[PDB]
Amino acid sequence: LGIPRYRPDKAETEPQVGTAQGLAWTPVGGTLLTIEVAAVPGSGKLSLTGQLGEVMKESAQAALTYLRAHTQ
């Protein structure tokens, strides 16, 4: 065959700083919706991408609320 285009049974992914490997069910088959997030500087805001519904927005907002309940 070709080279191994996907890594072996995943134990060599070397955890990265921001991305969270979240699983879900796309209509074309399984995947990991790696929710790659940007900890940008600034003055406080929140946006999304992917042209999705707001359900992601309130999920992220409630998440941020739980973090701010556990700041320090």
Add this chain to the structure above:
Amino acid sequence: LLAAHQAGIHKIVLPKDNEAQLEELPKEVLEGLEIKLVEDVGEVLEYLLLPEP
């Protein structure tokens, strides 16, 4: 690589995640190239915004 080879471009920039995918290439497609194997956008911008000052 073909689209950079026909357009008279020589030094190409590819992601190092394709380094194992690079050896797929024959010894004729890699004739006259110098790939700046990179993984961070910061290094692409270091070796391409070189006339920064």
